[PDB]
Coordinates of C-alpha atoms in Angstrom, one line a residue:
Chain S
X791 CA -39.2 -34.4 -36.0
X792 CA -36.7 -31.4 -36.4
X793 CA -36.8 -28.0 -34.9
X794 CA -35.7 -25.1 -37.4
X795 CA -33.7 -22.2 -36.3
X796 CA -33.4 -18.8 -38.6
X797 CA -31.1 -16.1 -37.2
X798 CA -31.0 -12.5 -39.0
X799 CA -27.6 -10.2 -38.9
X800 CA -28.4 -7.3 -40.6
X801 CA -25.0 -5.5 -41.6
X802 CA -22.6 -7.6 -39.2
X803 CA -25.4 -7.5 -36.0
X804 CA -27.9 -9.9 -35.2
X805 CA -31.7 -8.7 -35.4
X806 CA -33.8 -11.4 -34.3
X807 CA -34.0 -15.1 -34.6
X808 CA -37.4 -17.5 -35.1
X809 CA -37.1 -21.1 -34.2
X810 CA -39.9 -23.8 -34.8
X811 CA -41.0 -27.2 -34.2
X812 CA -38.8 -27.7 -30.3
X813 CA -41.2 -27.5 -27.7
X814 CA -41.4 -30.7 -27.8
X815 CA -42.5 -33.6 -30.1
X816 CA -42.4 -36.5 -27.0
X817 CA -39.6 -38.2 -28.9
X818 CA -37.2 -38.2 -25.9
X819 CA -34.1 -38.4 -28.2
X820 CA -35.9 -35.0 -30.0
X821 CA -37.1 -33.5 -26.6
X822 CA -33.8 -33.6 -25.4
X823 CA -32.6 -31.8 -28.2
X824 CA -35.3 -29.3 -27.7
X825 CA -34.7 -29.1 -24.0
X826 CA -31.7 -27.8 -25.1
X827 CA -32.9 -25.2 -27.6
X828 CA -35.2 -23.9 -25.2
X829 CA -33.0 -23.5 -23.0
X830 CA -30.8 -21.5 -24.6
X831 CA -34.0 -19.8 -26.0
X832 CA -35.3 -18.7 -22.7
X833 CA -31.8 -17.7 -21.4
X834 CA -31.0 -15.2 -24.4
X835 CA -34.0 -13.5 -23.6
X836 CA -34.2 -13.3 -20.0
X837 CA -30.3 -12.6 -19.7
X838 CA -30.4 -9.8 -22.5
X839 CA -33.1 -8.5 -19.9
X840 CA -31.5 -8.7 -16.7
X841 CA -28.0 -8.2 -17.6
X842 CA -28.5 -6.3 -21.0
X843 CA -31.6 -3.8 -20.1
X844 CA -33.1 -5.0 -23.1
X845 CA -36.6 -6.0 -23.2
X846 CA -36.5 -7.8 -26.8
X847 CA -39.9 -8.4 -28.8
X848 CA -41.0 -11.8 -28.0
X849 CA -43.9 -13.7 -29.3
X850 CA -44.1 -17.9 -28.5
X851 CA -46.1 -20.9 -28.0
X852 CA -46.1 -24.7 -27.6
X853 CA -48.7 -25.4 -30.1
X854 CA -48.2 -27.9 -32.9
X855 CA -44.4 -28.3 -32.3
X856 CA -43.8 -24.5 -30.9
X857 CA -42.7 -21.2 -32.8
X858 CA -41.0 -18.5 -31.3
X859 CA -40.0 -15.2 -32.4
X860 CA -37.2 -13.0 -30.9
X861 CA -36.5 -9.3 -32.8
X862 CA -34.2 -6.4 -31.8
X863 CA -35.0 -4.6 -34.7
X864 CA -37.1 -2.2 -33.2
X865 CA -34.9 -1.4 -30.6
X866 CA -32.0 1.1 -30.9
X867 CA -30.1 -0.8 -28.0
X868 CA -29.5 -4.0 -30.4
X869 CA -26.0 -2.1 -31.0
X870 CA -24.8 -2.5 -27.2
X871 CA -22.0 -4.8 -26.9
X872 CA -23.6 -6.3 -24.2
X873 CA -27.0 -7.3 -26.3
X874 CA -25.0 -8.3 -29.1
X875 CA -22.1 -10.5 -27.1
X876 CA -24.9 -12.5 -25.4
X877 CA -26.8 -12.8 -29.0
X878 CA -23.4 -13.9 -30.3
X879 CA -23.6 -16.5 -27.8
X880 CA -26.7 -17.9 -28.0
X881 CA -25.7 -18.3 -31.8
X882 CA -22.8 -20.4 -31.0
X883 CA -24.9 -22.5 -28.7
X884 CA -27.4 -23.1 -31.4
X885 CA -24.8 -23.8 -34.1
X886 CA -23.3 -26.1 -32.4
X887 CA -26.4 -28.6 -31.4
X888 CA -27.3 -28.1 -35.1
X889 CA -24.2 -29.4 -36.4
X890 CA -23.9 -32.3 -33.0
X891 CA -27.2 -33.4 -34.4
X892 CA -27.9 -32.3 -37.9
X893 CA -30.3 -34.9 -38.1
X894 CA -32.9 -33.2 -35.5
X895 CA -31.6 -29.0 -35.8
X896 CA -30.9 -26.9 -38.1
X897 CA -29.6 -23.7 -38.3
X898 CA -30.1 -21.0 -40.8
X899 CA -28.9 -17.5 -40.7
X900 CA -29.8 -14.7 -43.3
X901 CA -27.3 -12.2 -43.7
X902 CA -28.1 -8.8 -45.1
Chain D
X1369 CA -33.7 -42.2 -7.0
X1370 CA -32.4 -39.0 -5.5
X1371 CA -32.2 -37.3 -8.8
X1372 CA -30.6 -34.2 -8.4
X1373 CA -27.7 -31.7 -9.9
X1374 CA -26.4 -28.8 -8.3
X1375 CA -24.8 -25.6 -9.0
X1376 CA -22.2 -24.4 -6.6
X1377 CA -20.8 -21.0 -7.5
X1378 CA -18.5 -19.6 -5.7
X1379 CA -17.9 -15.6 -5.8
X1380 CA -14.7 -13.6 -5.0
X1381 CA -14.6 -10.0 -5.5
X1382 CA -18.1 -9.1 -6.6
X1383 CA -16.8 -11.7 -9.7
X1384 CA -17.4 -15.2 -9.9
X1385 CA -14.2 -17.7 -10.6
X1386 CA -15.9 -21.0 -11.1
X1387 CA -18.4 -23.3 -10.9
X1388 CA -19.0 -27.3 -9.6
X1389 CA -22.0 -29.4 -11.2
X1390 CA -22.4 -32.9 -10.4
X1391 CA -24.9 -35.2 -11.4
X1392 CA -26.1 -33.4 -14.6
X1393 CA -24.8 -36.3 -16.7
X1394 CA -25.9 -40.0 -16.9
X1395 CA -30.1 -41.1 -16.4
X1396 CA -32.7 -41.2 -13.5
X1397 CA -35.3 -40.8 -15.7
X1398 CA -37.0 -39.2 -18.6
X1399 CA -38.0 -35.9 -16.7
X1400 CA -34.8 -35.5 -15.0
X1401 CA -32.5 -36.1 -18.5
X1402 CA -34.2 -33.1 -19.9
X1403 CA -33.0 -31.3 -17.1
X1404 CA -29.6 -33.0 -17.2
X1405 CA -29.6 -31.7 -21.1
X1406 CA -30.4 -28.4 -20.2
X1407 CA -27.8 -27.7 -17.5
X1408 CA -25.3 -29.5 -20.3
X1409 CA -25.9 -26.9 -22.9
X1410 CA -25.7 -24.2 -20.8
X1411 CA -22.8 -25.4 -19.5
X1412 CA -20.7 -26.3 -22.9
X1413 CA -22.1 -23.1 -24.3
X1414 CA -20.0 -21.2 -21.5
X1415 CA -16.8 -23.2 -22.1
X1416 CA -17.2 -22.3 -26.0
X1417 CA -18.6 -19.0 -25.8
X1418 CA -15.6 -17.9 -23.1
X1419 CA -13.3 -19.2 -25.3
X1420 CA -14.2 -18.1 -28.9
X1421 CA -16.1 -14.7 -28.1
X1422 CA -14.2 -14.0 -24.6
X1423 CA -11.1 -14.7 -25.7
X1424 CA -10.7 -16.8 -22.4
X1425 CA -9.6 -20.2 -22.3
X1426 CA -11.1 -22.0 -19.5
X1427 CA -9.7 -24.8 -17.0
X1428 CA -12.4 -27.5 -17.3
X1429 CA -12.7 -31.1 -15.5
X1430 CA -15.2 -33.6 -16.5
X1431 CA -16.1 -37.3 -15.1
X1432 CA -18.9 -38.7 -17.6
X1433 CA -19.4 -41.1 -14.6
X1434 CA -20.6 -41.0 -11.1
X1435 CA -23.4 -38.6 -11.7
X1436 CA -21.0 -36.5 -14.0
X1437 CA -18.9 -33.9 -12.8
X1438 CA -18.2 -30.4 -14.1
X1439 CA -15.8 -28.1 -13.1
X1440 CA -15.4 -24.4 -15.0
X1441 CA -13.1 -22.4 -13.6
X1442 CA -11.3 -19.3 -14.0
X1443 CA -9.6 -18.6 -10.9
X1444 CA -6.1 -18.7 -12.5
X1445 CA -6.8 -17.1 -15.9
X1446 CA -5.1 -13.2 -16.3
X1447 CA -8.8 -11.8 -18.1
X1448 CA -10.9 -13.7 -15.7
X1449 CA -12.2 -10.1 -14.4
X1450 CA -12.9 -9.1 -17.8
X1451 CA -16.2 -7.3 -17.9
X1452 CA -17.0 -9.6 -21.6
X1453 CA -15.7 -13.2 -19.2
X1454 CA -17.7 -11.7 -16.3
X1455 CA -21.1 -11.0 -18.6
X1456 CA -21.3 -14.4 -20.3
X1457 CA -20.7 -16.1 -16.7
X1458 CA -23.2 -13.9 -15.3
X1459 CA -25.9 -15.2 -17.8
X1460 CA -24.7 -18.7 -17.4
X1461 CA -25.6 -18.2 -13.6
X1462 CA -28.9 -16.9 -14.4
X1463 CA -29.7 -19.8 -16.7
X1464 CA -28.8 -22.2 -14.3
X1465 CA -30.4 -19.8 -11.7
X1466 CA -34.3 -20.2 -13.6
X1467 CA -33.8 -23.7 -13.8
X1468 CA -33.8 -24.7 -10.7
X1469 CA -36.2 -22.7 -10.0
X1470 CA -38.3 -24.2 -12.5
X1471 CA -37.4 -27.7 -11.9
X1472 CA -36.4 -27.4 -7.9
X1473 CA -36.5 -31.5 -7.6
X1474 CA -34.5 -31.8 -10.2
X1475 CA -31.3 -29.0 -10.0
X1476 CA -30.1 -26.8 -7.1
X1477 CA -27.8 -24.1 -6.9
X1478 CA -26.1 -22.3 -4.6
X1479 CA -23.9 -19.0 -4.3
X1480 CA -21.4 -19.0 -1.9
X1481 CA -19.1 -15.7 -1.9
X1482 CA -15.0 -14.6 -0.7

């Protein structure tokens, strides 16, 4: 079991991000590791709502090991400091458990 | 048995300055771990993301035992009313905020302002 995490900065800004397989995998030492990229996951977008005004693109599931799909790129707000510091954020969270535990994350990120 | 952490912020000035969570660390269960590792992530990620992105180093405090024991604050720090400090803090209070909503038996917070 390992989750996989694909951020997207187009020209210095993040766009969007689609992480698979948390949701869990009832592996306790993997659903804790997916508890946390939920978490993180679910915060991003519900903060960059409450405290960014931005209603990202979101598209999710739990089904066979969960996919979910967060993009900015049709949104000319992306560019607010206050969407991309929380992004930035929620990129050094997932960074982070993906190098603590490179064994169950992994974290990708496409520059262009 | 009595498997619970809680969130205490505390708010001065429209700004919050810090933050006590006990209990978030150690077992009780499976159920209430996966809590425990949720409130943990959210919580490192506030430390690291104050102090990398908000240029704000952080007083922290930390007892792995006796439930665990968690103390972020920023009550002494010269750009602890900095709009970026106050964003990322506001968003770590939300988290927090959902997931004890979520999981009300499992993490509590409260807000209690000067």
């Amino acid at each position: 079991s390992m989750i996989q995490a694909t951020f997207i900065r187009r020209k210095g800004i993040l766009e969007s991000v689609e992480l698979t397989g948390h949701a869990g995998s009832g592996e306790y030492g993997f659903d804790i590791v997916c508890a946390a990229v939920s978490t993180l996951s679910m915060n991003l977008v519900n903060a960059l709502e409450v405290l960014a005004d931005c209603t990202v693109s979101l598209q999710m599931d739990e089904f066979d090991g969960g996919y979910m799909k967060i993009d900015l790129s049709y949104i000319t707000n992306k560019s607010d400091e206050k969407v991309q510091l929380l992004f930035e954020a929620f990129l050094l969270g997932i960074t982070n458990l993906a190098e603590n535990s490179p064994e169950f994350v992994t974290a990708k990120i496409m520059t262009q």
